Symmetry: C2
Subunit: 327 residues, 2 copies
């Protein structure tokens, strides 16, 4: 390629980044002909771990990895970025309530937004992973007034992929046989996994998921509940939070930005809500169904919203409005 792109991953000594870096370095995200300068940020006490991660990346003998830089300083980390994957955040520990998790992280993302605004390229694409994702993204965006608001997205693709898998498992097909599920709203308990516009190929024929299942109460109750609580279920089994599947979801999310959404499909992404036609307040970071071409996302327009869907999309909008006011 003409030039390597500089891709920053924060929280780079942690578990999600450990499952993500190889896929970036080996060409599976940005393309088999795209060299990459990988920039890794984490806190100062983690710099020794991060030198070990540099050693492993070296020992993968990846031809596209032109350089890997480890740092604990924002000026180094955010310099001339083409992509910023914001994984680092403060975790919710025992004893702290949801308000405290929000308070802890607002300062982190206001600072990374300021660094983006001062050091990165104005064309940088910023994908926000660390929780609370949507509000962390909004905070950073507001602190980066020189970077176009459309360049900020937050990760609902993990919830999206989980919704797909539950449908595929119930109906007995592969993941690629399901498409156009939607995660509306907050990456949180109030997310709405919507399948009113989803399709599945069943006997060579594409059918709606509602029609295919003949079980509306499952789709409107237990299905929603399973996708919302999936993260806690994984934590309960392996005593750690998801890392492999979260990294795979980041790869999907960034790849669809870089290359575009597949023909006939749209995907779930947290984006700035300004101008949406679905009754969602403006100036929220909210997950919508989008299509992507030339690295520019676009709302999927004209989807019919029934009354069950209306109630769910409004409840998640309310929670996001309340998180914003806390910040």
């Amino acid at each position: 390629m003409s030039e390597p792109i500089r891709v920053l991953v924060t929280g780079a000594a942690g578990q999600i980044a450990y499952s993500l870096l190889y896929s970036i370095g080996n060409g599976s995200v940005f393309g088999k002909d795209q060299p990459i300068i990988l920039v890794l940020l984490d806190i100062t006490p983690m710099m020794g771990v991060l030198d070990g991660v540099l050693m492993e990346l070296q020992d993968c003998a990846l031809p596209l990895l032109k350089d890997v830089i480890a740092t604990d300083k924002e000026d180094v980390a955010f310099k001339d970025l083409d992509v910023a994957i914001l994984v680092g955040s403060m975790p919710r520990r025992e004893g702290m309530e949801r308000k405290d998790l929000l308070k802890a992280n607002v300062k982190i993302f206001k600072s990374q937004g300021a660094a983006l605004d001062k050091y990165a390229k104005k064309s940088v694409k910023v994908i926000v992973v660390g929780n609370p994702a949507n509000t962390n993204c909004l905070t950073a965006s507001k602190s980066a007034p020189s970077i176009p608001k459309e360049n900020f997205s937050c990760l609902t693709r993990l919830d999206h992929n989980r919704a797909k898998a539950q449908i595929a498992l119930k109906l007995g097909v592969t993941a690629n046989d399901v498409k156009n599920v939607i995660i509306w709203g907050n990456h949180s308990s109030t997310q709405y996994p919507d399948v009113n516009h989803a399709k599945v190929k069943l006997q060579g024929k594409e059918v709606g998921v509602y029609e295919a299942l003949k079980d509306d109460s499952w789709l409107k109750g237990e299905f929603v509940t399973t996708v919302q609580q999936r993260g806690a279920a994984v934590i309960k089994a392996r005593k750690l939070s998801s890392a492999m599947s979260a990294a795979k979801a980041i790869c999907d999310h960034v790849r669809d930005i870089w290359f575009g959404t597949p023909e006939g499909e749209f995907v779930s992404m947290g984006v700035i809500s300004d101008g949406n036609s679905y009754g969602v307040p403006d100036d929220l970071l909210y997950s919508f169904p989008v299509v992507i071409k030339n690295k520019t996302w676009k709302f999927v327009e004209g989807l019919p919203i029934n009354d069950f869907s209306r109630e769910k999309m409004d409840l998640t909008a309310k929670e996001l409005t309340e998180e914003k006011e806390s910040a």
Copy 2:
């Protein structure tokens, strides 16, 4: 699509496997048109973590992953296998005498060899990763008399890839531009990282001639590669799973699809009939070319005096290991 192949990964609840399963599931090891039935084996205490691993594999929404089976039973794990990746072994607890460790691992791999011998396809490819890789692989091979000995291999590709990375680093070139490094012999400690037959494009020139620093290549390069895994563990304090999993993928891919034209790779294989003065009936890393899923020795490579000593010393380590373990 091809019919599904059944692929086992043992130690499936551990760190290396956690970094490996995605690459198998997403098609990058066995091909984008090859559906996979992924069989995961670990010890009963790990079954709870293993079910969370299974949940994450579902949550990747992988079209090629036809099914995922998680189990602690050999008769389930080894049925009708096309590939078995034996990652799990007994790790050495602090203050464990090596007699007890050799007995624990002989027991594991005798059992798994017997399960291969009774339940798997006779065409199964077996790749041994868990330490001590070479002797564990030999144990399983001898415990599986009906499986062709050539179907067994053990992982030296991690040290092979590390060697390639150090050469490219020292010559200021990209990883794609070095080929034909060799790891001879044992998987750890005494492994001989040999670049006497390696090429680098600057166009194509021998590495010794390109670098013009015989003592670094015979000294610091060798100890850097031999000690690289201990250096990563010191820094990360945890596994070296990301690069070990990449190496496993490279190793299995090169079995499945073959080595590129003009290139060989490093693989622990049964030493029978080699022409390099290595004892027979050893599992020993050699340079190999692979076609139609069948490896063959790269023959006739000139062995200088320095290389002969390095290859004999690692042969001696393996011989002593084999005698010690087979007392069990």
